[PDB]
Design an enzyme around this catalytic site. Structure first.
Site, mmCIF file in Angstrom:
data_model
loop_
_atom_site.group_PDB
_atom_site.id
_atom_site.type_symbol
_atom_site.label_atom_id
_atom_site.label_comp_id
_atom_site.label_asym_id
_atom_site.label_seq_id
_atom_site.Cartn_x
_atom_site.Cartn_y
_atom_site.Cartn_z
ATOM 1 N N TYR A 26 0.831 -1.176 0.014
ATOM 2 C CA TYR A 26 0.180 -0.110 0.009
ATOM 3 C C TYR A 26 0.846 1.466 -0.087
ATOM 4 O O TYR A 26 0.276 2.371 -0.332
ATOM 5 C CB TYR A 26 -0.963 0.049 1.097
ATOM 6 C CG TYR A 26 -2.202 -0.804 1.104
ATOM 7 C CD1 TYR A 26 -2.119 -2.118 1.215
ATOM 8 C CD2 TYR A 26 -3.413 -0.325 0.321
ATOM 9 C CE1 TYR A 26 -3.365 -2.991 0.904
ATOM 10 C CE2 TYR A 26 -4.603 -1.098 0.080
ATOM 11 C CZ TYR A 26 -4.440 -2.463 0.672
ATOM 12 O OH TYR A 26 -5.449 -3.111 0.121
ATOM 13 N N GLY A 28 2.449 3.997 -1.250
ATOM 14 C CA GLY A 28 2.589 4.392 -2.787
ATOM 15 C C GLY A 28 1.244 4.527 -3.292
ATOM 16 O O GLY A 28 0.454 4.662 -2.561
ATOM 17 N N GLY A 30 -2.266 4.237 -4.725
ATOM 18 C CA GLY A 30 -3.064 3.012 -4.754
ATOM 19 C C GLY A 30 -2.656 1.801 -4.135
ATOM 20 O O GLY A 30 -1.497 1.722 -3.638
ATOM 21 N N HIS A 46 -3.887 5.563 5.774
ATOM 22 C CA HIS A 46 -3.636 6.621 5.093
ATOM 23 C C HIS A 46 -4.483 6.700 3.970
ATOM 24 O O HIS A 46 -5.341 7.772 3.800
ATOM 25 C CB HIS A 46 -2.147 6.940 4.638
ATOM 26 C CG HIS A 46 -1.805 8.398 4.340
ATOM 27 N ND1 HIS A 46 -1.608 8.549 2.876
ATOM 28 C CD2 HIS A 46 -1.835 9.461 4.716
ATOM 29 C CE1 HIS A 46 -1.094 9.760 2.555
ATOM 30 N NE2 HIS A 46 -1.536 10.394 3.910
ATOM 31 N N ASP A 47 -4.426 5.870 2.901
ATOM 32 C CA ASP A 47 -5.177 5.621 1.658
ATOM 33 C C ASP A 47 -6.612 6.080 2.362
ATOM 34 O O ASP A 47 -7.182 6.873 1.577
ATOM 35 C CB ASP A 47 -4.991 4.314 1.184
ATOM 36 C CG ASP A 47 -4.016 4.135 0.235
ATOM 37 O OD1 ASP A 47 -2.784 4.637 0.660
ATOM 38 O OD2 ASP A 47 -3.949 3.610 -0.926
ATOM 39 N N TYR A 50 -7.773 9.439 2.928
ATOM 40 C CA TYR A 50 -7.788 10.245 1.704
ATOM 41 C C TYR A 50 -8.805 10.097 1.184
ATOM 42 O O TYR A 50 -9.622 10.996 0.738
ATOM 43 C CB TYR A 50 -6.631 9.928 0.889
ATOM 44 C CG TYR A 50 -5.486 10.744 1.177
ATOM 45 C CD1 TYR A 50 -5.044 11.399 2.127
ATOM 46 C CD2 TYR A 50 -4.600 11.218 -0.095
ATOM 47 C CE1 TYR A 50 -3.992 12.108 2.687
ATOM 48 C CE2 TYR A 50 -3.386 12.029 0.208
ATOM 49 C CZ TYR A 50 -3.086 12.324 1.531
ATOM 50 O OH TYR A 50 -1.991 13.380 1.915
ATOM 51 N N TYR A 66 -2.737 22.997 3.599
ATOM 52 C CA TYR A 66 -3.317 23.376 4.981
ATOM 53 C C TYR A 66 -2.164 23.896 5.677
ATOM 54 O O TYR A 66 -0.958 24.078 5.388
ATOM 55 C CB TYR A 66 -3.616 22.005 5.672
ATOM 56 C CG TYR A 66 -2.367 20.684 5.463
ATOM 57 C CD1 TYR A 66 -2.774 19.910 4.498
ATOM 58 C CD2 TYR A 66 -1.374 20.532 6.610
ATOM 59 C CE1 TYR A 66 -2.037 18.746 4.257
ATOM 60 C CE2 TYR A 66 -0.733 19.473 6.444
ATOM 61 C CZ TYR A 66 -0.844 18.675 5.214
ATOM 62 O OH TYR A 66 -0.115 17.567 4.958
ATOM 63 N N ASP A 92 -2.196 13.123 6.972
ATOM 64 C CA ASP A 92 -0.867 13.248 6.970
ATOM 65 C C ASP A 92 -0.132 13.121 8.153
ATOM 66 O O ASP A 92 0.909 12.276 8.407
ATOM 67 C CB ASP A 92 -0.581 14.477 6.224
ATOM 68 C CG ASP A 92 -1.025 14.546 4.573
ATOM 69 O OD1 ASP A 92 -1.047 13.414 4.191
ATOM 70 O OD2 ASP A 92 -1.436 15.623 4.230
#
Ligand SMILES: CCCCCCCCCCCCC(=O)O
Ligand code: NA
Length: 118
Positions: A26, A28, A30, A46-47, A50, A66, A92
């Site tokens: 994961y 990277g 996608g 994280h993905d 998002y 931000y 993040d």
């Protein structure tokens, strides 16, 4: 912001950028298969963070800028009024921290498309 995210990673660990660019299933762009270890699990979440962020009007995690602060290795999100800025900063932030905490297995560096990430 993809670049600010780079810095949170810089601000909270010893491991460099390319170190994460393509690791496990994961980390990277996608993700496929089941996360490899817990560092890859950091990337999984994280993905997903998002994806949820995208549920905010005019919210592109990948390009949203931000307000955050760094003091090696502590990092802070100063966004309050902009719901997207904050949701993405925490996304993040949580990742950077997650990364610094997880071990780095060198054998997972490029197992992508190699069959374990079905
Ligand atoms: C030189 C850095 C720019 C790379 C853009 C390429 C694709 C995936 C990037 C980051 C993923 C970070 C983490 O595993 O979520
Ligand atoms: Na991914």
């Amino acid at each position: 912001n993809l670049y600010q995210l780079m810095n949170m990673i810089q601000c909270a660990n010893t491991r460099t950028w390319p170190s994460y660019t393509n690791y496990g299933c994961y980390c990277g762009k996608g993700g496929s298969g089941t996360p490899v270890d817990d560092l890859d699990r950091c990337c999984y979440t994280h993905d997903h963070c998002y994806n949820d962020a995208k549920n905010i009007d005019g919210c592109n995690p990948v390009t949203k800028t931000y307000s955050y602060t760094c003091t090696e290795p502590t990092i802070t999100c100063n966004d309050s009024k902009d719901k997207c800025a904050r949701f993405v900063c925490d996304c993040d932030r949580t990742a950077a921290i997650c990364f610094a905490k997880a071990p780095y297995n060198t054998s997972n560096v490029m197992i992508r498309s190699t069959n374990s990430c079905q």
